[PDB]
From Swiss-Prot, chain A:
Gene3D superfamilies noted in UniProt: DNA primase, PRIM domain
Protein name as annotated: DNA primase small subunit
Subunit structure: Heterodimer of a catalytic subunit PRIM1 and a regulatory subunit PRIM2, also known as the DNA primase complex. Interacts with PRIM2 (via C-terminus). Component of the alpha DNA polymerase complex (also known as the alpha DNA polymerase-primase complex) consisting of four subunits: the catalytic subunit POLA1, the regulatory subunit POLA2, and the primase complex subunits PRIM1 and PRIM2 respectively. Within the complex, POLA1 directly interacts with PRIM2.
Binding-site list for Mg(2+) 2: 109, 111, 306
UniProt motif (Zinc knuckle motif) ranges: 121-131
Active-site residues per Swiss-Prot or TrEMBL entry: 44, 109, 111
Post-translational modification N-acetylmethionine, affected residues: 1
Curated annotation (Swiss-Prot), chain B:
Disorder cited: Pigmentary disorder, reticulate, with systemic manifestations, X-linked: An X-linked recessive disorder characterized by recurrent infections and sterile inflammation in various organs. Diffuse skin hyperpigmentation with a distinctive reticulate pattern is universally evident by early childhood. This is later followed in many patients by hypohidrosis, corneal inflammation and scarring, enterocolitis that resembles inflammatory bowel disease, and recurrent urethral strictures. Melanin and amyloid deposition is present in the dermis. Van Esch-O'Driscoll syndrome: An X-linked recessive syndrome characterized by different degrees of intellectual disability, moderate to severe short stature, microcephaly, hypogonadism, and variable congenital malformations.
Domain comment as written in the entry: The CysA-type zinc finger is required for PCNA-binding.
Subcellular location: Nucleus; Cytoplasm, Cytosol
Source organism, top-level taxon: Eukaryota
Name of protein: DNA polymerase alpha catalytic subunit
Residues of the full protein shown: 709 to 882 of 1462
Gene name tied to this protein: POLA1
Note: In eukaryotes there are five DNA polymerases: alpha, beta, gamma, delta, and epsilon which are responsible for different reactions of DNA synthesis.
Annotated function: Catalytic subunit of the DNA polymerase alpha complex (also known as the alpha DNA polymerase-primase complex) which plays an essential role in the initiation of DNA synthesis. During the S phase of the cell cycle, the DNA polymerase alpha complex (composed of a catalytic subunit POLA1, a regulatory subunit POLA2 and two primase subunits PRIM1 and PRIM2) is recruited to DNA at the replicative forks via direct interactions with MCM10 and WDHD1. The primase subunit of the polymerase alpha complex initiates DNA synthesis by oligomerising short RNA primers on both leading and lagging strands.
Assembly: Component of the alpha DNA polymerase complex (also known as the alpha DNA polymerase-primase complex) consisting of four subunits: the catalytic subunit POLA1, the regulatory subunit POLA2, and the primase complex subunits PRIM1 and PRIM2 respectively. Interacts with PARP1; this interaction functions as part of the control of replication fork progression. Interacts with MCM10 and WDHD1; these interactions recruit the polymerase alpha complex to the pre-replicative complex bound to DNA. (Microbial infection) Interacts with SV40 Large T antigen; this interaction allows viral DNA replication.
Assigned protein family: Belongs to the DNA polymerase type-B family.
């Protein structure tokens, strides 16, 4: 997954900035009806032209000159940036050390490289439907997390285009909470804690957290299908050798015994469960628990979190419907209403949306559908405004 | 007066008014006041010769950057201002211009064993450097 020729990108942005951007809807979605003064003007942008010359201190008063300059330059990477304490483009006027970042929309990102600890379907630049099963399942848990135990309803979801998916939520006041709260929620959702260094990455303690209960109820509906259908992870020495090396040892030979007398990958896990029923997670009491087996399942499909992007007030990320030149693909709105019907391969690139319009507004092609999610969130905002 | 014998270590014979008529009636003691003034200026020079006021003040002004002719005259505003401005107007600011502790209850009482003297020479420049204070760097209001 990438782009194949930067030759078209100049003219593509040339037309896009001209007549392919919800400058009305965007000015709205940012300024938020202008309910606050010096609200938009300090809401920052960062722009990146040829050779990736990324530059801070970018902002314009209202939609008109915003457009005019966007079309004057056509930046090739655009980050929305927190409303810092004062005038961004005139930052160096006040006494130094007095310009900082007050209030930021709360951001989240999850990578596909996250799953690379076991991901064997495709590469770091190439994908397939198998890994995308994760981009279909993981978001469900994270979404419903904020949908049922965080008292928010201003959620918005996008897939970057190459690896990550984004969530730029602008909740009533969370836009204006302390970095401490950021780190807090991060710590909260950071359940399976594993990169490429530690093996027993989940020392899940005894008593569960009902959050984890709903997590499980989601796991036993969407993991095993992908696992033993799209991968059949018990296929050769390679995969399960990246598996059995996190396990206690009293039975650690029976699993391989089931490994290499096989014509499928089902009775293996079946006898796994069986011996677990005769295994003792607790030598003390009669609570034979799914600690290790479900740690296995979850860790093999769990949203790996970032420890610095979901707390900092300096990392800025892309704009709604701003092109990712290095995939063609542009920001695709993602919804629970669409999680059951998404495919990454069919959704269009900048090249493809261009060839779409290369045939008045977004009101003709599938871009009006794609921004139905946008204007839907905006509708909710109208309902958010009293 | 006291300095005559502290650093300079000699005598200072002095004569009030009512003896000035005596010395009007005198050639030995009048001439003696004359040679006394001779020695006065002499010791006055010896002051410089020992304390080395001249090259000291000279080097200071050299590093100070302000009129030495207005240095000896006494001043701390000059030897700070006309120094700081050197750098501050390499930094393209614009400055304003001219117009018009803690005691610790000394616990008095004789002390017999040895006593030590701690000097906090270079305390304020020390603290200022240590904590990086500078005009531009405080929301001062
Ligand atoms: Zn694959």
């Amino acid at each position: 997954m990438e782009t194949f020729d930067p030759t078209e990108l100049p003219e593509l942005l040339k037309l896009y900035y001209r007549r392919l951007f919800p400058y009305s809807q965007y000015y709205r979605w940012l300024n938020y009806g202008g309910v606050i003064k010096n609200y938009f003007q300090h809401r920052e942008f960062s722009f990146t032209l040829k050779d990736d010359i990324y530059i801070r201190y970018q902002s314009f008063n209202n939609q008109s000159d915003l457009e005019k300059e966007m079309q004057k330059m056509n930046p090739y990477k655009i980050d929305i940036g927190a409303v810092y304490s004062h005038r961004p483009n005139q930052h160096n006027t006040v006494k130094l050390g007095a310009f900082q970042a007050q209030e930021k929309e709360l951001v989240f990102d999850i990578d596909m490289t996250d799953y690379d600890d076991v991901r064997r379907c495709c590469s770091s630049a190439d994908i397939c439907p198998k890994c995308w099963t994760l981009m279909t399942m993981a978001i469900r848990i994270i979404d419903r997390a904020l949908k049922e135990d965080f008292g928010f309803k201003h959620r918005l979801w996008v897939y970057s285009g190459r690896r990550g998916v984004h969530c730029w939520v602008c909740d009533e006041s969370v836009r204006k909470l302390s970095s401490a709260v950021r780190s807090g929620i991060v710590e909260y959702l950071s359940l399976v804690k594993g990169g490429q260094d530690v093996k027993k990455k989940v020392h899940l303690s005894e008593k569960i957290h009902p959050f984890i209960r709903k997590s499980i109820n989601i796991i036993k509906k969407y993991f095993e299908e992908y696992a033993l259908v799209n991968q059949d992870i018990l296929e050769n020495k390679e995969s399960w050798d990246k598996i059995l090396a996190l396990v206690p040892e009293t039975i650690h030979d029976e699993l391989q015994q089931s490994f290499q007398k096989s014509h499928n990958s089902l009775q293996r896990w079946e006898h796994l469960k069986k011996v677990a029923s005769r295994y003792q997670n607790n030598i003390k009491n009669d609570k034979y628990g799914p600690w290790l087996e479900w740690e296995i399942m979850l860790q093999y499909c769990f949203p790996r979190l970032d420890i610095n992007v979901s707390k900092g007030i300096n990392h800025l990320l892309k704009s709604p419907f701003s092109v990712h030149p290095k995939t063609g693909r542009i920001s695709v709105p993602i919804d629970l209403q669409k999680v059951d019907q998404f495919d990454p391969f069919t959704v269009p690139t900048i090249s493809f949306i261009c060839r779409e319009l290369d045939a008045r507004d977004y009101k003709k092609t599938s871009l009006a559908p794609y921004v139905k999610v946008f204007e839907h969130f905006l509708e909710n905002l109208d309902k958010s405004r009293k | 007066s006291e300095l005559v014998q502290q650093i300079l270590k000699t005598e200072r014979v002095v004569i009030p008014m009512e003896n000035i008529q005596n010395m009007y009636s005198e050639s030995s003691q009048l001439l003696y006041l004359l040679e006394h003034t001779w020695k006065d200026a002499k010791f006055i020079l010896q002051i410089m010769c020992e304390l080395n006021v001249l090259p000291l003040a000279l080097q200071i002004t050299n590093i100070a950057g302000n009129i030495m002719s207005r240095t000896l005259m006494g001043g701390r505003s000059e030897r700070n201002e006309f120094l700081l401005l050197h750098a501050f107007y390499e930094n393209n600011y614009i400055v304003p211009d001219k117009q018009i502790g803690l005691v610790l209850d000394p616990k008095v009482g004789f002390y017999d064993k040895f006593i030590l003297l701690l000097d906090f020479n270079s305390l304020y420049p020390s603290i200022i450097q240590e904590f990086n204070i500078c005009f531009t760097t405080v929301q001062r209001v």
